[PDB]
Amino acid sequence: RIHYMVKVGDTLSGIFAQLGVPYSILQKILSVDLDHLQLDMIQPGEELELMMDDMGQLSRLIYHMSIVEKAIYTRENDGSFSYDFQEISGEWREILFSGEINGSFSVSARRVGLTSSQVANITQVMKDKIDFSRSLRADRFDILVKQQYLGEHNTGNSEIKAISFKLAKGDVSAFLAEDGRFYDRAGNSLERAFNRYPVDKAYRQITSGFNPKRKHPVTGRVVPHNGTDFATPIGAPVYSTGDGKVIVVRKHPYAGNYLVIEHNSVYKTRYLHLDKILVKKGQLVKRGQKIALAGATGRLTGPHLHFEVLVRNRPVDAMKADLP
Ligand code: NA
Ligand SMILES: [Zn+2]
């Protein structure tokens, strides 16, 4: 058994290289990860656990994303690797981050415990209701956050549930609803809705829909199709289904060229097998904006766009009824 803690700069391929794992084995792991793409997002501090057999060959890899979540890659008799995801539901605690404006909101928010990303999420959500340049105080704020713990250990997982500002120029408050978007007290959403399709009408034919229980034709084992396939010719324009920011731009051996956009604290969308990517990391995009050209890169039986919608990092049927 090998315990490896991810450090700045590491990639799954780099870790395998330093731990002596063969290229062929790296490819089997990348192959099964096509349908999950968990290993591409490894961050410093997370841990990889490698289980070697009597022959000193990798028999199982455990990717500890957090103390309550792990992806398990197991070697099968046929040489391939199978995937299993395990999640433990610890306990969630509520924490209130309150402060007064004497520094600017950002400074005061950071001083009271909120992170940069939390401050960004807050300013993003409240941008139309608050001018963080003119509405300046004496004014205070209260942020309700839910933090997940495991026993006495903070998992690092958290989510802002409510945002309220006590302003002299008028109080403002927003709450995270069941649909993953923030609404004001009157029920007006502070975040824009999404388009259902990532392509033009001409290519909306679905050749293969979302199906987490899909069984492999050869082995009979469950190999989930975590996205929707659209019948696009190589070169067809691909558009973002929502406002957001490009957070991932990679060239994967199996998923081919792919992109991931973060729309808000809850939603993300993935676009795989692209022939060409027209945006870069950090770039903000609008709903309906062209972000790439469909392709046939990676591993596939034919050209097509594989589209995914993730809710709190869990894939869901992009064509499902309830979803903003
Ligand atoms: Na290698
Ligand atoms: Zn697909």
| Fold of the domain spanning 89-192 | Nuclear Transport Factor 2; Chain: A, (3.10.450)
- Rounded to the nearest 5°, which phi and psi values hold at 120? -65, -45
Q: Is 64 annotated as a binding residue?
A: no
Q: Is 179 annotated as a binding residue?
A: no
Compute the distance from residue 300 Cα to the ligand 2 centre, in Å: 9
Compute the distance from residue 64 Cα to the ligand 2 centre, in Å: 26
Compute the distance from residue 22 Cα to the ligand 1 centre, in Å: 6
- Which residues, other chains included, contact 209 with Cβ-Cβ below 8 Å and sequence gap of 6+? 225, 228, 229, 317, 319
Bridge partners of 259, per DSSP, are 249, 271
Technique behind this structure? X-ray
Compute the distance from residue 226 Cα to the ligand 2 centre, in Å: 7
**Domain with residues 193-324, CATH architecture:** Distorted Sandwich (2.70)
Looking at the CA of 23, name the nearest ligand.
1
Compute the distance from residue 208 Cα to the ligand 2 centre, in Å: 7
Instruction: Please give all residues whose CB falls under 5 A of ion ligand 1, grouped by chain where several chains appear.
Output: 17, 23
Does domain 1-88 fall under CATH 3.10.450.350? My reply is yes
Q: Is 229 annotated as a binding residue?
A: yes
What is the identity of the amino acid at 169?
Answer: K
- Which residues, other chains included, contact 74 with Cβ-Cβ below 8 Å and sequence gap of 6+? 59, 60, 81, 82, 83, 84
Count the neighbouring beta carbons within 10 Å of the beta carbon of residue 248: 15
Buried b (16+ CB within 10 A) or exposed e, 97-136: bebebeeebeebbbeeebeeebbebbebbbeebbeeeebe
Where along the chain do the CATH 3.10.450.350 domains lie? 1-88, 89-192
Compute the distance from residue 133 Cα to the ligand 2 centre, in Å: 45
